[PDB]
Design a protein around this motif. Structure first.
Motif, PDB file in Angstrom:
ATOM      1  N   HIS A   1       5.780   2.183   4.952  1.00  0.00           N
ATOM      2  CA  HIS A   1       5.463   2.224   6.377  1.00  0.00           C
ATOM      3  C   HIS A   1       4.919   3.588   6.861  1.00  0.00           C
ATOM      4  CE1 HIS A   1       6.626  -1.823   7.161  1.00  0.00           C
ATOM      5  NE2 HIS A   1       7.927  -1.647   7.020  1.00  0.00           N
TER       6      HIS A   1
ATOM      7  N   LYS B   1      -0.600   3.415   6.712  1.00  0.00           N
ATOM      8  CA  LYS B   1      -1.889   3.463   6.026  1.00  0.00           C
ATOM      9  C   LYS B   1      -2.665   2.184   6.228  1.00  0.00           C
ATOM     10  CE  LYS B   1       0.860   4.129   2.654  1.00  0.00           C
ATOM     11  NZ  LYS B   1       1.855   3.310   3.395  1.00  0.00           N
ATOM     12  N   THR B   2      -1.952   1.053   6.168  1.00  0.00           N
ATOM     13  CA  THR B   2      -2.560  -0.260   6.455  1.00  0.00           C
ATOM     14  C   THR B   2      -3.105  -0.273   7.872  1.00  0.00           C
ATOM     15  OG1 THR B   2      -1.041  -1.355   4.895  1.00  0.00           O
ATOM     16  CG2 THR B   2      -2.388  -2.766   6.313  1.00  0.00           C
ATOM     17  N   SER B   3      -2.319   0.258   8.803  1.00  0.00           N
ATOM     18  CA  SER B   3      -2.707   0.332  10.211  1.00  0.00           C
ATOM     19  C   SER B   3      -4.005   1.117  10.363  1.00  0.00           C
ATOM     20  CB  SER B   3      -1.623   1.012  11.031  1.00  0.00           C
ATOM     21  OG  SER B   3      -1.358   2.295  10.499  1.00  0.00           O
TER      22      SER B   3
ATOM     23  N   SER C   1       2.849  -4.431   3.438  1.00  0.00           N
ATOM     24  CA  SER C   1       1.652  -4.609   2.626  1.00  0.00           C
ATOM     25  C   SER C   1       2.171  -4.580   1.170  1.00  0.00           C
ATOM     26  CB  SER C   1       0.605  -3.511   2.914  1.00  0.00           C
ATOM     27  OG  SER C   1       0.189  -3.500   4.281  1.00  0.00           O
TER      28      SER C   1
ATOM     29  N   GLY D   1       3.055   0.819   0.264  1.00  0.00           N
ATOM     30  CA  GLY D   1       3.914   1.970   0.335  1.00  0.00           C
ATOM     31  C   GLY D   1       5.120   1.712  -0.527  1.00  0.00           C
TER      32      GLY D   1
ATOM     33  N   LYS E   1       1.451   9.499  12.567  1.00  0.00           N
ATOM     34  CA  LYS E   1       2.600   9.302  13.463  1.00  0.00           C
ATOM     35  C   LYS E   1       2.927  10.519  14.324  1.00  0.00           C
ATOM     36  CE  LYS E   1       4.694   5.300  11.120  1.00  0.00           C
ATOM     37  NZ  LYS E   1       5.979   4.777  10.577  1.00  0.00           N
TER      38      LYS E   1
ATOM     39  N   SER F   1      -2.305   9.099  14.647  1.00  0.00           N
ATOM     40  CA  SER F   1      -1.265   8.206  15.120  1.00  0.00           C
ATOM     41  C   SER F   1      -1.930   6.853  15.243  1.00  0.00           C
ATOM     42  CB  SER F   1      -0.692   8.660  16.454  1.00  0.00           C
ATOM     43  OG  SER F   1       0.376   7.822  16.855  1.00  0.00           O
ATOM     44  N   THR F   2      -1.657   5.993  14.278  1.00  0.00           N
ATOM     45  CA  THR F   2      -2.356   4.733  14.166  1.00  0.00           C
ATOM     46  C   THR F   2      -1.858   3.696  15.167  1.00  0.00           C
ATOM     47  OG1 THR F   2      -0.854   4.213  12.342  1.00  0.00           O
ATOM     48  CG2 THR F   2      -3.055   5.024  11.777  1.00  0.00           C
TER      49      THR F   2
HETATM   50  N1  LIG Z   1       5.595   5.485  16.829  1.00  0.00           N
HETATM   51  C1  LIG Z   1       4.630   5.227  15.911  1.00  0.00           C
HETATM   52  N2  LIG Z   1       4.710   4.085  15.169  1.00  0.00           N
HETATM   53  C2  LIG Z   1       3.774   3.782  14.235  1.00  0.00           C
HETATM   54  C3  LIG Z   1       2.660   4.708  14.040  1.00  0.00           C
HETATM   55  N3  LIG Z   1       1.866   4.213  13.096  1.00  0.00           N
HETATM   56  C4  LIG Z   1       2.415   3.042  12.702  1.00  0.00           C
HETATM   57  N4  LIG Z   1       3.558   2.781  13.379  1.00  0.00           N
HETATM   58  C5  LIG Z   1       4.433   1.581  13.259  1.00  0.00           C
HETATM   59  O1  LIG Z   1       5.287   1.622  12.122  1.00  0.00           O
HETATM   60  C6  LIG Z   1       4.890   0.578  11.232  1.00  0.00           C
HETATM   61  C7  LIG Z   1       3.950   1.204  10.206  1.00  0.00           C
HETATM   62  O2  LIG Z   1       2.646   0.638  10.230  1.00  0.00           O
HETATM   63  P1  LIG Z   1       2.196  -0.328   9.033  1.00  0.00           P
HETATM   64  O3  LIG Z   1       0.697  -0.512   9.120  1.00  0.00           O
HETATM   65  O4  LIG Z   1       3.118  -1.531   9.049  1.00  0.00           O
HETATM   66  O5  LIG Z   1       2.526   0.572   7.732  1.00  0.00           O
HETATM   67  P2  LIG Z   1       1.828   0.215   6.332  1.00  0.00           P
HETATM   68  O6  LIG Z   1       0.731   1.211   6.080  1.00  0.00           O
HETATM   69  O7  LIG Z   1       1.475  -1.250   6.341  1.00  0.00           O
HETATM   70  O8  LIG Z   1       3.011   0.418   5.266  1.00  0.00           O
HETATM   71  P3  LIG Z   1       2.915  -0.365   3.865  1.00  0.00           P
HETATM   72  O9  LIG Z   1       3.037  -1.833   4.195  1.00  0.00           O
HETATM   73  O10 LIG Z   1       4.105   0.107   3.073  1.00  0.00           O
HETATM   74  O11 LIG Z   1       1.563   0.079   3.344  1.00  0.00           O
HETATM   75  C8  LIG Z   1       4.280  -0.505  12.101  1.00  0.00           C
HETATM   76  O12 LIG Z   1       5.325  -1.328  12.624  1.00  0.00           O
HETATM   77  C9  LIG Z   1       3.591   0.294  13.179  1.00  0.00           C
HETATM   78  O13 LIG Z   1       3.531  -0.420  14.422  1.00  0.00           O
HETATM   79  C10 LIG Z   1       2.635   5.913  14.878  1.00  0.00           C
HETATM   80  O14 LIG Z   1       1.692   6.711  14.728  1.00  0.00           O
HETATM   81  N5  LIG Z   1       3.623   6.114  15.765  1.00  0.00           N
END
Ligand SMILES: Nc1nc2c(ncn2[C@@H]2O[C@H](COP(=O)(O)OP(=O)(O)OP(=O)(O)O)[C@@H](O)[C@H]2O)c(=O)[nH]1
Lengths: 82, 593, 403
Positions: free
Chosen positions: C42, C45-47, C89, C116, C168, C214-215
């Motif tokens: 989490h 990166k997917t975001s 992911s 991740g 983030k 901050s995605t």
């Molecule tokens: N507060 C905050 N939350 C975030 C930020 N970026 C992502 N999140 C949240 O935390 C989670 C991480 O985003 P994901 O896209 O699910 O992470 P990921 O890249 O898919 O992680 P993997 O599945 O392991 O690759 C999601 O629930 C997002 O809504 C950020 O910049 N700030």
RNA sequence: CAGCUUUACAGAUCAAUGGCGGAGGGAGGUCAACAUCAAGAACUGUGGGCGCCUAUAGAACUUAUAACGAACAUGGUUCUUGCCUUUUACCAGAACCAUCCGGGUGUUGUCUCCAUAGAAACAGGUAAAGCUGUAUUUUUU
RNA sequence: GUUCGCGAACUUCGUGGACAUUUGG
């Protein structure tokens, strides 16, 4: 910044043609370009102003002495202009 | 232009001719009609008979427009029959949901304060009036002393400045402005500070801990998984096993005692958290979540935007340069709002029935089981089960024409939309309900038995076997009677409140008592026992409230917060009305098919 | 032959840049960065990849209303039921996109979104193998965990160019509610940690390697990017690189058009804190807190980006997100950073040697391509193959080996 | 401090061409009647309006998922528990239909506040609003 | 709320169970 410069940069990789002040056309893969059109090119032919042609490896040219650059027609499409 | 006109004409006269919208008449007229009806005492007209069909619906509607502790008198719009019958509420109640929550919180706070204060809290006696006699009331109510101070806590000008002028009002307020759609009151919009204030007010009530991870294995999906694995969580619920429990493993070459190594205990908790691994043969088991960890700070101090309880690290103006100092006066709480649960993280929304807006839900989903008593835990579990099953089987509706609107439109004999005090309306309904019951009785074998005005039916005299046979009647009828009684009880409490020798706090408390004791105060369970489920649910809710309420030294009979119980009751009514209506129809259509 | 192709094209989201151009570019190497976006569980990166996708395309099919608003992510590369239902992911379900830079040199990038979660290092490994550059991504808050360190170690081995994404920032602005100074300090610490984890290369916001993101809200910037957008207005072109250099590190800037003395007088808050982090903080506050009209005015003045009439009636988190998207534009900065990172092609030879022994290549006489991972992209099986040398045409009669 | 468009205008000739439409309201209401309902709408069809919008209707595929409704009650058949036996009435779980209670969307009407031209621009002038702007090696001393 | 049991100072607090209903007259 200059959009022609940008275009030139984009053309990197592609086979550009290139005449100088002397009138000595080149044609080659554009290796590197800078803000001042300081071009490098690979696998490049070199025509003399009179007529005769000469193959050569990695030519450098200084934009000051460059006259005009022909880029491939694919770059017309995208994605520099808008 | 001519063409346009023609088109317009075509649009008009093809379908749906103008049915005139009838005017909003005076309440005086209605009162007069009622009086006339009373004087008359039977008529047995056809129209009247027809209208009676919709009494449980009417009752339900009345219940829905209950005046909340913060409201003096719910002035309410009504449909009523030319005779002075079936006089039922029109408007649907609805609310700005965060505002509603805030209001509820305020009420709760007030109740708590009252508890802290008063020593000998005099609880309300039921049934409130002499059932033998017929003590109804209208004129007295109308020209009574000023409806004394309802339940709204005193707000300071510093902290909750943006709400206190409007928060406690009928609709509620913020009703006439840019902050709502309008008086139709369907779409609400807000600025920040007010929203923040509302949130703050709520906190006492709805402290839902919204670290999504908190609900690890307490998400609805997780519960579903548990259900369809016949698996449990100490705090979570348990069910029938969903598939047939037919093991017969037969200790094979694979899964022997001397082949596998029982190193992990493999508790139930695991089996739902990893449905496809630990449980073999997971039929209809949804894939659960797996989220990240929360870093946060939520505080109630003067200073803002500082490290409080973290660990400390090792060691042309820029574009805003005194436009600003980095913190505005609202941004302290803006951040909090942003972090929040549903209602408030949004600064606009759609409004909802107030028989929606479950304020219980968030407590009984919040995994409490540490230092509570066992009964409370059980109640919580029950609540969860109730929720979970509902979630599992949703329901989809489609195109429909609503009854009240139809009556308003097509029916004569109706007068419509007389703005009555809700209490008055309730009283009328009670009277009308009683009348209806009598009529029904008359239609059947004319009986020895007579109704109490507070609906407790009983025989006058001359008890025989034949009589019994005659006058068993239906369970439906008894259910209806029970419902009526309930209404009377709630209506009667409001009546009491309106007159002296009472309190507003007592009012809410009385209501709570009524709702959270149907089982004690009037037996519906006797006639329809699916009401027992409802009763149980109500009890559970009450239990949840009481511990939640009485964290402080207060412990005793005084505690309002009837909302969830009320909601439950409403739901029950909704479930039951149609059947009742059908029964009524059948009764009326006795001679004909 | 053509009809089928046309049909395929039709059953697809129309990209904002012309895909023909991308194809043309792909005919030339050195205009193709293969990027493994990698990080801990989490990271977001997917975001981030989702953001890129959004930027690329005009309108996406299953981009809901809520996701558009900026509530739920639209993790565009989550794909299969497993992943959307689960939260993680899970497989290497990447994407290819043309991306302009600061100075718009388009370049067709082959992004591969790693998983991740540590029990899917397989996919991460595959990505690493594929991708000559790797965007490491990190949660600000969770910091450079041991996992990230491990990744870094096992990206030096491969080998690959390591852009970082401190993703983030919102979490430190809104969740931790660090003061700006504190936030800056934290960032510095993180950077230091990263450096330590690394052997040879130093990483920092200058030299385009850190990408602050901050995605959730959906902004990435590099410092150069920031300068381009919002500090060309106020400085002459010649002193822009210098300004950028100044921006990071133990540096202060007092009222002096235009110096900028390292250290110092009275009220602190460094160059980075003054010209970046502080600005971000302000934006956040204003976005959430301030009277909307005033915010709009500010954004007209100090950023020249207009909060629309429809956008003004948003809820906060969405509104904030919108604001940040308006500010820091469709993420070119990230791409630029990536480009800067990738040497290029000094590394590439080494990487190939590592993959398949040292030696000498043959361009014309043959082609060869690493079949990296079988997948299930469109239901049916494909082999995600990387063509290293030559050109592999459709229908071509081909040799193979399981390794 | 320069330019172009866009409104207010003065007094034009007056084309001229554009644009403006040759003019049809904007709100809301616990006002109605009528359809049509997870959003989707891909891709196709067939309209208006120009390799493309806007309407329609047709399936595809989406995920539905959490929320047409951050809501949840009630029926019936069948299967299975269980009261048990019998009637209701139910215990407690499935499957498929139905029932209310609420909901939007546009279509239209009707009822109370806000409005308000019957054309304007060319040639530029006045006022404001919006975008673009210093010689010594690579551009123009 | 209504009964039965147990702990502390009939009375009250701390607590473990059990609490439908009418047709078959
Ligand atoms: N507060 C905050 N939350 C975030 C930020 N970026 C992502 N999140 C949240 O935390 C989670 C991480 O985003 P994901 O896209 O699910 O992470 P990921 O890249 O898919 O992680 P993997 O599945 O392991 O690759 C999601 O629930 C997002 O809504 C950020 O910049 N700030």
């Amino acid at each position: 910044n200059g959009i022609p410069v940008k275009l030139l940069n984009e053309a990197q990789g592609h086979i550009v043609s290139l005449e100088l002040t002397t009138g000595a056309t080149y044609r080659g893969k554009l290796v590197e370009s800078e803000d001042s059109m300081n071009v490098q090119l690979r696998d490049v032919i070199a025509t003399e102003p009179q007529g005769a042609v000469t193959h050569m490896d990695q030519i450098f040219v200084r934009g000051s002495q460059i006259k005009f650059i022909v880029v491939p027609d694919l770059l017309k499409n995208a994605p520099l202009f808008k | 232009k001519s063409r346009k006109r023609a088109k317009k004409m075509t649009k008009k006269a093809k379908r749906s001719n103008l049915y005139t919208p009838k005017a909003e008449m005076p309440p005086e007229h209605l009162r007069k009609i009622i009086n006339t009806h009373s004087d008359m005492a039977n008529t047995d007209k056809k129209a009247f008979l027809g209208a009676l069909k919709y009494l449980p619906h009417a009752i339900l509607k009345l219940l829905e427009n209950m005046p909340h502790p913060w409201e003096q008198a719910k002035e309410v719009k009504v449909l009523y029959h030319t005779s002075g019958a079936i006089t039922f509420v029109n408007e649907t109640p609805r609310v700005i949901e965060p505002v509603y929550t805030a209001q509820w919180s305020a009420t709760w706070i007030a109740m708590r304060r009252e508890k802290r204060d008063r020593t000998h809290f005099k609880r309300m006696r039921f049934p409130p009036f002499d059932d033998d006699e017929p003590p109804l009331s209208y004129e007295q109510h109308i020209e009574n002393i000023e409806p004394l101070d309802p339940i709204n806590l005193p707000l300071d000008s510093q902290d909750d400045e943006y709400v206190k002028d409007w928060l406690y009002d009928s609709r509620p307020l913020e009703e006439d402005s840019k902050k709502v759609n309008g008086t139709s009151y369907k779409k609400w919009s807000f600025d920040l500070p007010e929203m923040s204030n509302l949130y703050r007010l709520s906190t006492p009530l709805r402290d839902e801990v919204t670290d999504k991870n908190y609900y690890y294995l307490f998400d609805k999906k997780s519960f579903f998984n548990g259900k369809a694995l016949n698996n449990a969580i100490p705090g979570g619920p348990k069910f029938e096993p969903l598939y047939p429990r037919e093991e017969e493993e037969d200790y094979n070459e694979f899964n022997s005692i001397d082949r596998v190594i029982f190193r992990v205990p493999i508790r139930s908790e695991y089996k739902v958290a990893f449905p496809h691994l630990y449980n073999s043969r997971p039929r209809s088991v949804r894939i659960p979540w797996y989220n990240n960890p929360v870093s946060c700070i939520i505080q109630n101090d003067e200073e803002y935007d500082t490290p409080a309880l973290f660990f400390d690290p090792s060691l042309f103006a820029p574009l805003l340069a005194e436009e600003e100092e980095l913190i505005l006066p609202n941004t302290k709480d803006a951040m909090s709002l942003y972090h929040s649960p549903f209602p408030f993280n949004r600064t606009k929304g759609k409004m909802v029935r107030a028989q929606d807006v479950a304020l219980a839900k968030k407590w009984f989903l919040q995994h409490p089981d540490e230092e509570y008593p066992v009964k409370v835990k059980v109640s919580y579990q029950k609540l969860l089960k109730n929720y979970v099953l509902n979630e599992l089987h949703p329901t989809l509706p489609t195109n429909h024409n609503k009854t009240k609107l139809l009556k308003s439109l097509k029916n004569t004999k109706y007068f419509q939309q007389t703005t009555i005090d809700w209490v008055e309306a309730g009283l009328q309904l009670c009277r009308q309900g009683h009348n209806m019951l009598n009529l029904l009785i008359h239609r059947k074998g004319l009986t020895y038995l007579h109704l109490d005005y507070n609906f407790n039916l009983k025989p006058t005299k001359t008890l025989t076997t034949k009589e019994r046979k005659k006058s068993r009647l239906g369970n439906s009828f008894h259910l209806m009677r029970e419902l009526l009684k309930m209404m009377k009880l709630i209506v009667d409490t409001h009546v009491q409140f309106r007159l002296g020798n009472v309190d507003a706090f007592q009012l809410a408390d009385g209501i709570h008592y009524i709702l959270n004791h149907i089982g004690q105060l009037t037996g519906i369970y006797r006639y329809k026992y699916k009401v027992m489920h409802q009763i149980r649910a109500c009890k559970d809710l009450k239990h949840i409230i009481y511990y939640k309420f009485n964290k402080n030294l207060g412990k005793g009979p005084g505690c309002g917060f009837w909302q969830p119980a009320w909601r439950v009751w409403l739901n029950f009514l909704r479930g039951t009305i149609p059947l009742l209506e059908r029964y009524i129809g059948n009764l009326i259509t006795r001679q004909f098919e | 032959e053509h009809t089928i192709f046309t049909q395929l094209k039709k059953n697809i989201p129309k990209t904002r840049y012309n895909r023909d151009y991308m194809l043309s570019m792909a005919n030339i190497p050195e205009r193709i960065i293969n990027v493994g976006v990698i990080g801990p569980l989490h990271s977001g990166k997917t975001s981030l990849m989702d953001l890129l996708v959004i930027d690329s395309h005009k309108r996406i099919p299953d981009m809901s209303k809520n996701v558009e608003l900026g509530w739920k992510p639209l993790r565009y590369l989550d794909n299969l039921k497993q992943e959307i239902d689960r939260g993680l992911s899970i497989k290497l379900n990447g994407s290819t996109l043309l991306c302009t830079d600061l100075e718009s040199k388009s370049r067709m990038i082959n992004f591969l979104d790693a998983p991740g979660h540590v029990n899917f290092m397989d996919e991460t490994a595959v990505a690493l193998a594929a991708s000559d550059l790797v965007l490491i991504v990190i949660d600000v808050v969770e910091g450079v965990t041991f996992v990230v360190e491990q990744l870094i170690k096992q990206s030096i081995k491969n080998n690959v160019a390591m852009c970082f994404v401190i993703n983030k920032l919102d979490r430190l602005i809104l969740d931790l509610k660090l003061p700006p100074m504190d936030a800056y300090l934290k960032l510095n610490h993180i950077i230091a940690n990263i450096n330590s984890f690394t052997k040879g290369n130093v990483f920092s916001p200058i030299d385009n390697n850190i990408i602050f993101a901050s995605t959730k809200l959906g902004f990435t910037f590099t410092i150069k990017e920031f300068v381009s957008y919002y500090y060309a207005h106020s400085i002459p072109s010649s002193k822009i690189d210098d300004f950028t250099t100044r921006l990071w590190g133990s540096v202060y800037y007092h009222k002096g058009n235009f110096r900028t003395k390292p250290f110092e007088n009275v009220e602190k808050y460094p160059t980075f804190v003054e010209f970046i982090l502080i600005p971000l903080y302000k934006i956040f506050s204003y976005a959430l807190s301030m009277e909307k009209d005033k915010l709009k005015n500010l954004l007209r003045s100090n950023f020249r980006v207009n909060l629309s009439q429809e956008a003004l009636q948003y809820d906060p988190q969405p509104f904030l997100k919108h604001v940040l998207q308006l500010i820091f534009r469709q993420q070119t900065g990230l791409v630029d950073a990536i480009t800067r990172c990738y040497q290029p092609f000094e590394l590439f030879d080494n990487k190939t040697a590592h993959l398949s022994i040292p030696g000498k290549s043959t361009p014309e006489g043959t082609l060869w391509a690493h079949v990296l991972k079988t997948v299930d992209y469109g239901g049916a099986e494909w082999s995600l193959v990387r063509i290293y040398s030559g050109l592999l045409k459709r229908g071509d009669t081909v040799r193979i080996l399981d390794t």
